[PDB]
Symmetry: C2
Subunit: 39 residues, 2 copies
């Protein structure tokens, strides 16, 4: 989902990246279930 | 200057806008001297 950092870019400029938040933080300082099958 | 929001944008995206801080803060809630002259 795109929100709160990719939103502003996707609106004012027109492109977005997935891990924009991790990129920002690094750049500027600051269940399972069982099923029948065959193996 | 470009810093802390245009920095990441210009480094990963390739574009940068002037008043990025204000539009960001908007989308998500978040002395003179005397000289002589001829008037």
């Amino acid at each position: 989902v795109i929100a709160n950092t990719n939103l502003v870019t996707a609106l004012v400029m027109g492109k977005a990246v997935s891990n924009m938040d991790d990129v920002a933080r690094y750049l500027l300082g600051g269940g399972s279930a069982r099923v029948r099958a065959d193996l």
